Amino acid sequence: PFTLGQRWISDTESELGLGTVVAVDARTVTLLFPSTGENRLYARSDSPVTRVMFNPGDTITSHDGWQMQVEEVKEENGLLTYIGTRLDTEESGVALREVFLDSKLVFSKPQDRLFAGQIDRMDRFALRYRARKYSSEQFRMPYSGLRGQRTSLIPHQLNIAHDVGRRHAPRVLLADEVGLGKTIEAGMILHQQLLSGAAERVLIIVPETLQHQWLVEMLRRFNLRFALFDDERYAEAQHDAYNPFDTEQLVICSLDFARRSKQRLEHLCEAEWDLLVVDEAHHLVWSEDAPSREYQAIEQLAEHVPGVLLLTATPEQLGMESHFARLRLLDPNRFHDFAQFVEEQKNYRPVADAVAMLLAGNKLSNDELNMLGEMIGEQDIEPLLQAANSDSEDAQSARQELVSMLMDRHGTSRVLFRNTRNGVKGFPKRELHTIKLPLPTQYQTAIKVSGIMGARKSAEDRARDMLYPERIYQEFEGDNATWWNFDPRVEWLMGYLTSHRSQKVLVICAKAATALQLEQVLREREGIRAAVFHEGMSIIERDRAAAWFAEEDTGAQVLLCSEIGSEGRNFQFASHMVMFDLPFNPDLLEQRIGRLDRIGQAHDIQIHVPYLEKTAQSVLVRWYHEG
Amino acid sequence: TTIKAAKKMVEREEAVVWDILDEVIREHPVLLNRAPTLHRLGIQAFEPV
Amino acid sequence: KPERDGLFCARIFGPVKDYECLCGKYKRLKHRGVICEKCGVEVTQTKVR
Amino acid sequence: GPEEITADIPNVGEAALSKLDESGIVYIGAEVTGGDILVGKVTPKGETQLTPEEKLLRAIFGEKASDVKDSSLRVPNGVSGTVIDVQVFTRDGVEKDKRA
Amino acid sequence: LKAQLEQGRDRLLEIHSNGGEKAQALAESIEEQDDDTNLIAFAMNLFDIIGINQDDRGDNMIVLTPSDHMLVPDFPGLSEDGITITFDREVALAREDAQFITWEHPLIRNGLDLILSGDTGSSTISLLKNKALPVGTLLVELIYVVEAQAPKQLQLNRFLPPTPVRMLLDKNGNNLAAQVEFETFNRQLNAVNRHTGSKLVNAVQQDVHAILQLGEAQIEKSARALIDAARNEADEKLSAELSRLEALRAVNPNIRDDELTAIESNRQQVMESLDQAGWRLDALRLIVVTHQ
Amino acid sequence: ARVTVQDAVEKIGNRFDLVLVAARRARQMQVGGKDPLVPEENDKTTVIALREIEEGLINNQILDVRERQEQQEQEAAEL
């Protein structure tokens, strides 16, 4: 029924408007969309279009902007031509060939779709209804924005997320201890802000060695995508617009990069960000008489953006006073010197003593009570105090509300946050076993010669050599010498593994070559499927191995870590840990044990550690476990 | 619950599969044939065991 | 690729993959029937070869 | 381009790759049952071009240049047994892998 | 050194940062929340309609891949290699290789936007099987949307998000939506072929324009109540926040004037904006009763 | 009728019409949701239809009468 000149609408591409039949053939028809001026060619069969016509009495608009009131419509040669009375001047009888309608047709209300002959399938109506219903429902939950992050449910984290995510332009001091999850809290805050729409542009400042980590973490936990600005990218984006720093929404940059040119620092200062994220704030050193070079630039930045998050710790076990050095960035008015702040902390300390004594369940001196009476400025203290002090029936809630009142008067309760291992429950217990093994002679034969060469070398380095004998046996006898054929340790490990086929075991060793050789021995001598995990791999192969180790009953049984960089996935089902050999300084030993000592263990960790007698291991096991 | 669960349960050959299979074939004749089929008694319908 | 105007031409007979043209501009349901102009193959099933 | 024989096959679980050495050929003595892998082969295919952001990503995650099919050899189903002998033929001009 | 350290504690900070019993109750609440099965039965259907193949693997892992019949050329999150998703929390904690799909993941939000924003499913014509009922009766389904307009940083989402009203009219404008549930009603309907439905609507062409303005009489009053109720909640909770914040302000030097000024301004703006709500008609379905 | 189908043949008349009648009845039990008459004894629907035919309960006209009754009565009770 297609004939030249008519007006048709594309079924699916309604974002074009009306179209006109320019030419026809036996199988192909051509339409022009003047509103965009675009040529389209449709095959006659299957008719992916629809005809448009206006019923008498309605209104039509011509291309010159003057409406009409249609009264009759004629058809000739298949072509439909309208007649109506104008509405601007109300002249009657004016006719329009339909090729003089608008260029933009709208069907904003669906009944025009239905009347024009547009029918979809039934199911899509069901989806539309259910979709809008669920959206309406799920927007409103009080705790929305805290279910999409890939982390277990840890209350001392959700509390901070709830507290700081429901502020306006917050500015806090996240100074949690290591192993507690400061960066997880920062991610939670960013997620909570970005989901409610409360902010859009975010700056993040981290030094060069850490940048990549942040990228991957974000992309794999909080579903946020970032762009990286280095010297290169900023250079070619200098052309692209006036401020290159306006092309994107979330930005990663290092402070040393911003300090390269001051014009660049101004470019950062002038881009109107919402949130600023600062990393390792404890490195940023300031003195009242010596304001450092790095301090001034961040001080300049902190004045044009409302919200700041600071990531820091309190190293070298120095008191909270040092936090003052940065706190001036948050609220420069309330802080005006350090001496008064230290004085107030000194004043708080006896009150801390009193509350510690009270919560311990022991009686309070009446002389001390008129320091808690001073610290809170009221006069209804005594009825509360006598009840809470003598262990009454409701002394617990009395004490709780009293300490709540003192909390409301804390110096830095709402501006500073701390988590310590001591006060929060959930950590599992660490149980030890030890086994000693007899020394085979070949090691003595090798050591009697090796004891000479490391003469003009550190006792640190001399011990670092002798500590683990295998790597010196290799040097005398040639590399890949068959050292795994008379050790007691390998035999003990195989014996232990093969009698407990239902335990997942994490074996950690010294370096990569040792890990690979242990894996080969196990695989070809006892058929124990083992998965290696060392620091030369890519980031995908690590994921493949860690995925295999997690299969519950058909997958691997032993994970051979080689001096792990503590990138630290959650190994929630591994409970036993075998320490093949021992390192020097205890911090990385805590690293090792904390690869499994995280909140959420079902059972308590058990550590094994077999050692050869009369060697470095003999000294070190004693020194660690007993000293 | 789903088809893939059934695929794996059948391939691993767990005893419930043997019980179900013994249930299904009951009262379900099959056709046995031998070629060449010269006359109409060439294919017949038996009942499995 | 099928030569144009040859014994396998996609202009004459049909597409090679479902709801895709040859050059690769339009794709998969929004352009149903839209005879693409630059390569000239209708966008329908391949059970038309 | 050219095929390759390798152990890094895209989209295989770690389970099936215990029984291949570095060069990607079965051990001698390992006993196979229908469905396993005998030789790891990958066939390169078209290289479509890209945007800088994924260049950064694929340089951090670090895995590939030429997203590539696999067409390895596998035991046709219903067969089993115990491999007893592996032979490798090479041209004159191809670098000899370790196992040959 | 251990004794000297343990004497140097400031336990008020620790008892403050832990949250208390309320934080534990909150965590448990989310724990009970994470066992929803509505999301699975919704997401599976949505992905089957948009046209994403779901191959099931078995260990609570499903792989998604775009198919040949997809509703849109290119989608935000997918790629022709397919991705893996899991709705459980523990499995997703052990496998940092796989996505974690909840009500806040970009796939759900982008699919929701694609369905809602466009015009799919708006115009449907159907048929109903009831020989117990007179021939030629009319039933019309109306999908009313209640809306407010304001920039996002006012977060109207928490008071009056786009809210639906389902309306079921007869020839004399009497409701049946309040009586019959959607699923039981719709499970008895069926469809019609395209061409016959194309004309069948025309014979009742005027009747539709007769129907709507009947329901327009009541929908507005419904709208009023929602805004009225909404305003009350907008009045209530924020004021308590107001009530709380300055209550702390007069006691400690850690409260800035900017926060309270901003919240007062936001309250006035949100009240004024929510006093400007509107409503539109988004979808409609025709129901014609036959004796077949 | 587990083994031999001799009686039903005399009970209806052809080796062929028996097939159609029994198939229709077993269909009614298969999906239509009706209930059998002779006790199950842990047997498939097909042999149940054959036993019903042999005993003299499900002929052809009986099927017609029964379906007519159910149709009319449900239609009348619709209002």
Ligand SMILES: [Zn+2]
């Ligand atoms: Zn094309």
